[PDB]
């Protein structure tokens, strides 16, 4: 992402800080949520096997 000299943050949907500029070294780094999901258990009948 190209940042103007006077810009600090970024927000695509206007409530999430998508990007940020490091105060020490003036470079621009983007930020992504780590990970998450659901766990599903595929199984046949417990009567059949385990």
């Amino acid at each position: 992402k190209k940042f103007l000299p006077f810009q600090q943050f970024g927000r695509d949907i206007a409530d999430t800080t998508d990007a940020v500029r490091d105060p020490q070294t003036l470079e621009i780094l983007d930020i992504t949520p780590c990970s998450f999901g659901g766990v599903s258990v595929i199984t046949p009948g417990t009567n059949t096997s385990n």
Partner: nanobody
Amino acid sequence: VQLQESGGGLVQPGGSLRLSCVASGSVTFNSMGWYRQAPGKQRELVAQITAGGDTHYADSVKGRFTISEHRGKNAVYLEMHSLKPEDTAVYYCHLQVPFLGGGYDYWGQGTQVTVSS
């Protein structure tokens, strides 16, 4: 805020170093300049490169300090050679934003370089 400058350190006389003006974004300008200032002395213009490419050099720094500009990283560079104890100072770089016909440079931050044995 805009521009900040970092790099370099203390080196014994007879060495070399590289000073960098870390990029703070793509800005319009026409003259990237370098001074060094030491306590008890005024801010002396030591180096200056132009948008055209004119490398101004002061008489006490010719042949030892050189300027380059990297458009790929937008950053200015100063390669320093054959250091002397008179070079002990804090170094700052101005830009050439064209305010009101020209002015309001941005050397607000610099790097301390001390040359001593």
